[PDB]
Amino acid sequence: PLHSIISSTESVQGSTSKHEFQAETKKLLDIVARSLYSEKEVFIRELISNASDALEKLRHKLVSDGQALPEMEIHLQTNAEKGTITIQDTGIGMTQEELVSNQFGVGFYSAFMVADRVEVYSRSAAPGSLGYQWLSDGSGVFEIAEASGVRTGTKIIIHLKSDCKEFSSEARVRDVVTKYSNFVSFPLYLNGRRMNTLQAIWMMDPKDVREWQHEEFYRYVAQAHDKPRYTLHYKTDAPLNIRSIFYVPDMKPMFDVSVALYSRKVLIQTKATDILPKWLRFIRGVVDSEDIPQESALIRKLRDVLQQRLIKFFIDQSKKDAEKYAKFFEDYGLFMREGIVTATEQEVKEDIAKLLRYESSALPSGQLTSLSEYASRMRAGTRNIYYLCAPNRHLAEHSPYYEAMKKKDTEVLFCFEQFDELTLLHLREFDKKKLISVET
Ligand SMILES: COc1ccc2cn(C(=O)c3cc(C(=O)n4cc5cccc(F)c5c4)ccc3O)cc2c1
Numbered sequence: 001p002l003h004s005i006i007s008s009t010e011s012v013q014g015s016t017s018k019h020e021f022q023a024e025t026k027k028l029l030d031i032v033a034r035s036l037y038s039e040k041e042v043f044i045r046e047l048i049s050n051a052s053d054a055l056e057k058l059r060h061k062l063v064s065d066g067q068a069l070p071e072m073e074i075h076l077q078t079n080a081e082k083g084t085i086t087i088q089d090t091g092i093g094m095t096q097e098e099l100v101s102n103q104f105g106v107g108f109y110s111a112f113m114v115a116d117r118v119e120v121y122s123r124s125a126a127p128g129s130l131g132y133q134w135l136s137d138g139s140g141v142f143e144i145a146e147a148s149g150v151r152t153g154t155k156i157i158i159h160l161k162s163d164c165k166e167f168s169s170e171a172r173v174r175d176v177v178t179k180y181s182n183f184v185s186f187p188l189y190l191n192g193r194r195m196n197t198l199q200a201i202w203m204m205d206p207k208d209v210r211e212w213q214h215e216e217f218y219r220y221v222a223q224a225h226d227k228p229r230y231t232l233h234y235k236t237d238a239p240l241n242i243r244s245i246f247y248v249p250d251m252k253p254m255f256d257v258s259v260a261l262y263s264r265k266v267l268i269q270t271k272a273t274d275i276l277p278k279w280l281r282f283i284r285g286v287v288d289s290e291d292i293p294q295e296s297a298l299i300r301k302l303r304d305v306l307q308q309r310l311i312k313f314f315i316d317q318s319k320k321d322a323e324k325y326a327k328f329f330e331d332y333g334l335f336m337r338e339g340i341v342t343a344t345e346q347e348v349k350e351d352i353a354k355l356l357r358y359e360s361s362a363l364p365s366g367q368l369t370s371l372s373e374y375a376s377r378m379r380a381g382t383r384n385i386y387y388l389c390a391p392n393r394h395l396a397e398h399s400p401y402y403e404a405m406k407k408k409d410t411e412v413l414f415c416f417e418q419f420d421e422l423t424l425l426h427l428r429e430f431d432k433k434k435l436i437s438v439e440t
């Protein structure tokens, strides 16, 4: 059966009171009316986001009391024969003061992007609150009147413009909801039918997400069938709001030609390249930041924060399980080398270089060392990092130049990957120590 709450229960006994929009609001309404910039479908995800916020505010306050929880739901209704789309939620609602004084910005301008007029009913969840009707056609006036039959929460009826009638088709609205609003955290219904929505596990505290939940989400966001070999659930609130999960696949890398971008569980970009550095394009997963608006200073800042955190994560993994990290470096190490070569900043080159692992003349065959570990073994008076590129360890060890160096205890990195020469040429130095090939 169907489950709908939207219907014409409201009535207004008296006359409305007329108010004039304040000057800046009127100016923004003028921009909307004249704007041809028309990613028009966005109003739906903003209204759903505001409904979700209103529901959470109610739920938290009732839980802070001993109070039972009512039905907390978001409903959409389309009406083709009347050219409307309606959203209604059973959240905290608005007082008359807020309807006159006042998120209320974002829901407002995008509604008037698609509306000839907007008809709102709201009733605060506070006990003894009255219901109100708010009306505007986007001119400099709005109307408010006390209304009977308003359900606690907020209902917004958008009377669509003649060129926006597509949003009174159920199938069109269904697709918009699924595209941008699939992870809304309260039950969502369209025309009485429950929408298939998913759990935004990146918002949970990382200690609460189980491996089976990560495996299901990884397979979903990567459209994969393996499991992730690594999982980084990164939550921070400074300098930026970040709720993110990053996976690296169990399978090897073609992946050589990403990460979805959200803002409080609202999709911004399905496949947001530019959010990670190019060399991290093998990462799958999701990044959610409240701080999001396009080659902005903010995106650059988020990218640099995430790069540092992922490098730290991989360093941490090498300490937790060196054998698993060595396999990761074997499988994904060409991305690290690419990043060193293409990086502009020396500090970024050296940060990525902390992930490189090489054999060494000082270690058993097959055992790997990092550049930092090599540096900690350098003997006083010797101030450079020496390496030798060769096809295998036997050929490196029988270099006449290495053999001579053995006499004075100098460690030499043994590098067997064909792109090691270019990587270490471009790195040039590490921790103020020049990288020098022992053969020219
Ligand atoms: C904690 O944050 C809170 C705290 C309390 C909150 C109450 N809220 C609402 O009652 C509400 C507002 C919208 C909305 O987008 N608009 C846009 C309008 C334009 C003109 C006139 C209007 F009445 C409009 C409303 C949609 C659904 C909602 O439930 C949201 C909240 C969010």
Ligand SMILES: COc1ccc2cn(C(=O)c3cc(C(=O)n4cc5cccc(F)c5c4)ccc3O)cc2c1
Residues within 6 Å of the ligand: 401, 404, 405, 438, 439, 440
């Ligand atoms: C172990 O410590 C040492 C100590 C000394 C070392 C010298 N080493 C050399 O490889 C070397 C270079 C040259 C030279 O003049 N070259 C090499 C060129 C290659 C390309 C283009 C050019 F123009 C070149 C000019 C001559 C003899 C050499 O043995 C490794 C060393 C290692």
